[PDB]
Amino acid sequence: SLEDLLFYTIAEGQEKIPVHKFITALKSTGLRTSDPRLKECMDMLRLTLQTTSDGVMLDKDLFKKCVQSNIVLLTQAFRRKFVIPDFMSFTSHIDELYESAKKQSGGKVADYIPQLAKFSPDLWGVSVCTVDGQRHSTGDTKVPFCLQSCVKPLKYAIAVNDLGTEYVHRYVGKEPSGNKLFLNEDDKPHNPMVNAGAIVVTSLIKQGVNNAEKFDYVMQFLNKMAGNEYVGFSNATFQSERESGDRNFAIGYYLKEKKCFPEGTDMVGILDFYFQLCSIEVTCESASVMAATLANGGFCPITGERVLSPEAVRNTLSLMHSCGMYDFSGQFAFHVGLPAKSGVAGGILLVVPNVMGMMCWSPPLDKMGNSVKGIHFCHDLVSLCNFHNYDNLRHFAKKLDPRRE
Amino acid sequence: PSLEDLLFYTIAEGQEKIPVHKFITALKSTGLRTSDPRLKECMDMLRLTLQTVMLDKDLFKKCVQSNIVLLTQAFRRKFVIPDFMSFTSHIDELYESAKKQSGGKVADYIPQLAKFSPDLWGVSVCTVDGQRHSTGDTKVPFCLQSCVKPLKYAIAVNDLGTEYVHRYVGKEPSGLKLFLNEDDKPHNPMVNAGAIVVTSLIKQGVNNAEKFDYVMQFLNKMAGNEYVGFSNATFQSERESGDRNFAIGYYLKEKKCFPEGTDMVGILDFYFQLCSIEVTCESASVMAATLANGGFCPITGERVLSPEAVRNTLSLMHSCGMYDFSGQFAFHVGLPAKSGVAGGILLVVPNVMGMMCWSPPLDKMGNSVKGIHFCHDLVSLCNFHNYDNLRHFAKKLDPRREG
Amino acid sequence: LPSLEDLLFYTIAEGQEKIPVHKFITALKSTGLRTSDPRLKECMDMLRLTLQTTSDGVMLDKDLFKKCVQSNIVLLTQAFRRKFVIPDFMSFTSHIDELYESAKKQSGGKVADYIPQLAKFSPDLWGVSVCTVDGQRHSTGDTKVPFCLQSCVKPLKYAIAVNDLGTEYVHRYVGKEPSGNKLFLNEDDKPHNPMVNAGAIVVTSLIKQGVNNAEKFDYVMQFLNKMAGNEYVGFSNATFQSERESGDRNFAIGYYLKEKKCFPEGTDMVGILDFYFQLCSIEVTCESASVMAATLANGGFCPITGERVLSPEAVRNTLSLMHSCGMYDFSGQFAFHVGLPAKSGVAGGILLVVPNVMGMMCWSPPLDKMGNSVKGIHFCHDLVSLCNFHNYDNLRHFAKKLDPRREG
Amino acid sequence: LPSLEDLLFYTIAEGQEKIPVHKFITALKSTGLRTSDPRLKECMDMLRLTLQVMLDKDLFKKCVQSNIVLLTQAFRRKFVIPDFMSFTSHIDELYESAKKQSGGKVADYIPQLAKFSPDLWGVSVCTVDGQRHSTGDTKVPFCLQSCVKPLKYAIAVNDLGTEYVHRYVGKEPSGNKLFLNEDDKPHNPMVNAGAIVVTSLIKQGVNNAEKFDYVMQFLNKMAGNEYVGFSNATFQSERESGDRNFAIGYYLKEKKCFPEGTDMVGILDFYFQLCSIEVTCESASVMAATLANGGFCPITGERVLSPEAVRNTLSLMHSCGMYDFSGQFAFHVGLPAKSGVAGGILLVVPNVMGMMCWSPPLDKMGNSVKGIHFCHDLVSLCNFHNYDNLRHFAKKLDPRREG
């Protein structure tokens, strides 16, 4: 009877519902028709469109046949049970923040490698994926770009997922440095979000196998986090990174000298693996799904698959909060109060826990290496919405709570 | 149709009249105290009718109609922790477990702190809805000490705004000795130099006595007019032995860290007075619940601090509130907290509740041994860590849900 | 064996039967010695006394000359037979006057103005005084103008502490190395060295423990009087009262050291700060301060009195720490380029020592961004460019540098 | 008018008509000079020819006339330490006192250093006039290691000048785990980062083979053509285990610390070769005496380094040459010295002598236990401290005086 109950609410007193009406109403919830959790429904709608005696009409029996396999998710979407029930209104707010941030033309595109330097400063995109799979994009959201340091929290969650907090943190610290030092007083890199930390974390993953097997193993995790949306690789960026990596070779030799790597590590191979991990490509859309997996406790919103352990996600979000934005980590944690991670390509992987994931991208960076438009957008998002980590959910002054209505 | 009639039928359970003890027992089960300021009219009505035991529909309506909204919320399991009886049972287990952690050293730089028994141990809970639970030595007064730092920081932000306050003080941890950051400002409000500067921003232009009266009235509203006191014995000793604070004060003065016209010597005096403010676990748990409730005191419903003041406070308590254990605490516990040398840990679970954990023995980092152990246990049991997911939380308990 | 007095007579007489008194005094002054030298008192009293009783006006025969000079014949023989460290002293003072005029053109810098007593001084005051390890003197410029020692007292009170307590006791409370800056304590929880404020404050607390500040001050004054050959050592109460009123920086150090248990047991920190401000307010002229520096250059013996003022241990330690930490943040650059133990103060003085050769006091109120006197800095660089006085200049193979210890 | 050769003949003859060749040789050796002294070659060649027994006034003049000046200085006690025989007895006493200090640990990061016996101990003296004394294992080759740092820095300053060299390296102690000072330059040439940058300045434009040959020819002149070698075994081990130096190299390259057109990997290789240069105590004591003699080699009289190079080298050896013990050594010993991980201590007593102390066991700072003990005892005994007075020196001895 759930299919019947849904049928009557969409039909609006009519005997049959046109398929375009059902599809339009489904899209207004935030879900895409291409959502992996609605495939059985969409395949049945397509097949019935082929065999139907009607033009585009669906009676109670035909509707039941089409929607029965995905009735649970469809009932939540149509009964406004998603984390942001009025999704159309929220995306209109996102579009306003996107336009406001678009006006901030300052910053300098990264030019140490030609692959980053080629990007237009005007490229600006923002994608949202809620913990329920509601999607919204504005701007250049289907343009590939390298994750760069945005991969640091992702590989750290993979290390914690497989090894646990205790083992992983025998090699890397868990606090901000407060910085040019590679090691803290305990002779460990400060945290996984700095280069020395990321390099030590890279050395922890899938130990014992060649870099090709390690890379594939990581890629499978990223595919699952992104709901099998675009996760690619730029060998052009990789070759340039490995060529101009004096800074990372200094870290590598220092770490090896200070015995920072697990026994039996080949540091030169680990740096090579690290340069490969930085050169992984995403779009705003696919990377917003990875950030939504982090907002959703390790479950991929658009698939329902458990990708990461709750412990891996909590630790990752803890360290993104305090160490994810370089020298602006403390200011960002204070004013924005959201777990975020930036990369030198212009990415800002943003998590609003229990609500949504985002990817903001604009190549021009500020003097701290963070995307000008992304930083602007993040501040405006928290000015508008009660998404700050320490904003109250009952008493939030002139802020808007999109979880309300 | 009448909310009072509806509530009467649920408590009566088919009977013509509800005995007063039955209603009081049921009310207390929700977590509310009969002495709750928002229930004053109901209790004054009950006392008048008690002067004349059985409450009929008419007498029940007459007693409860003034506070029917909150009473309906309480009886209809609409509070942040619906099954409060079950939750206070877990708090009691966590309390008994931390009770066995008898290690640490009671502070002995001043004799007022050194006098406190190491076996004094208390935990008080105040939810964002005013549900209360105490276990241990929760009515024994002790000095807030550095537990006052986030409270005076909240007052300064409340009255002056974020930008003005942060002209004088930073907003980040220093990273594991220096009084000033690269910008010649104390690192944050949670360290002594930062707190000393935050002290100089409050009620500028008036004498210390008026400033202290102003801060006391503020803490009274924050605690819902529950116990707030002052220990002159502690103030005299802190001042006599505050060489570290005098070194900071002269350094800040030399470095021009204070607003123009500051009397540094008078500011240090005010600062030692604020450190010597006394609270109980019970009254300090209400202060922490005002911070968990976006500035509204949960037992009075009063707007005490701006949402901005509270948000900034919790942010800096999260990263800077536990001295050298701040980074470890934010990672493992993930709750905004503030410890003091008297053994108090002011703990906030945003949107859920405030707490005051108190036991005088401190660890090598200056934090209460029992309190630290208790915070770790609380977050192992419940999905209260900042970055614990509210939908998928593994085998942890969520006291916000029914079953 | 012919008389030493007769030998000296024949060399000054130049074949004549009698030497005129002005001839002997002119020849004496040309050595660098002053007639007012405390070691020549008996000679000068007898010259003045014989000038009253003389029958042949302005004439000294063999016997009359013997009568005057016999009491100080040893020093006079060294002076006249060119046995002093700088034998051609007139040529050397000519070079000093050239360096002085060169540095006088360096009118840059800012006079210290945190206390009105320092801000009062004219930027044009510039003096240079020399006192060799043999008592040879030379002054050019404003050498008789009193000014406070300020941080130039740091090596002197340190020398006093080592003289009385020894290296071991003193360095239990203070370090012996440059810091490398804004920290009051090193990794061992001690002030880095005695030449920084925290170190000087700690050294102040080691001197004459147990007695009041009046007895402590008098004790240090007696030492400074002997180091300066009983020449001008005064006190500026005006400067002292201003220093104690605006010494928040020093009060911060004081409470920090007291908190960190940096002082000897039973120290009254506020009284030590008070004594420390009094030590900073001690006044000297270029001349009297150049004698203090020459006592340090002469292994603890005062060159103009011959008196042992400090132990060789005290002097060696002071010069070691003046060389590496004496010029604030310019210490390393000064140690490398000038290679001379030196100490600067905020009044514009630079207490300079050329070990085994001479002491100096360069003074000009305008300071550079480091706190060092502009004229004094430039003068020190010119001195070492001209002369082989650098700590590590070779005394045998010194390229085109001049060596004033040689005849030519 | 009477010949200097005849004059010297009469002072050695002692009323005799002829001087036996053994008497002259014995008398020359007591001055401190060795018969193998390169400035005495013409005298010794003449002696061997006339041999391949009795030398008359004519045969003595025939043998000594070419070197009469140096021989007259030696026999007329004109050398820097006139009573050299007495001085060498005090050195033997200091050597024997340090010999008993059996503590320390021989370096083992490379098997080449680890192979050395901890009982190996030698002390060599070469005055600025070429007077020689040796006690212990003074003819045993060992690697210079960081003892080469002052020597390559002297070469760099000799060839490029102070201004040029110091655009790449500082001139002060760091007072330390940082590779670069505030100005993005290595702190000084005596630390590893500084030495590596100094290495990149030597003979720019040519290959490492020509560069190494050039440094070797310079070290030959410094040592008066005495033993200077190379340990390829030490070199291959330093390359295999130089992670610390590769981290420095990549850091310097990233921070643009090298002159334009520098191949850093090739520079690190040249640096490992420079560290692997072997000397004996005797040959290295002559290098140290070239530094004590203002750039002139005492046993050849050749100008090897410019005064500027030597003055700058001694300034930096004074404050930077003993690692974490630099400041304590500058204060207590007051002498320009440079230590190496093989046990060497290149010691300079300006205007007096050069020395090489060698004993493989090192203390926690990396300095030779016996070498450090020896340096302290030498300055306890003699007024050799940089800030000892030459006139008033309490109970110390001045070997430069006759008695």
Ligand SMILES: Nc1nnc(N2CC[C@@H](Nc3nnc(NC(=O)Cc4ccccc4)s3)C2)s1
């Ligand atoms: N200005 C500059 N010059 N060279 C620089 N670097 C050289 C390579 C890097 N060296 C380090 N990385 N981590 C380090 N950790 C420690 O020292 C441990 C420690 C930290 C804090 C207090 C006490 C101890 S040293 C950075 S930075």
Ligand SMILES: Nc1nnc(N2CC[C@@H](Nc3nnc(NC(=O)Cc4ccccc4)s3)C2)s1
């Ligand atoms: N070991 C010790 N000795 N003296 C000590 N104190 C003396 C008084 C206090 N001094 C300071 N407080 N804050 C400072 N800040 C800076 O220097 C600015 C800066 C901060 C961080 C990075 C770079 C620059 S100095 C503590 S601590």
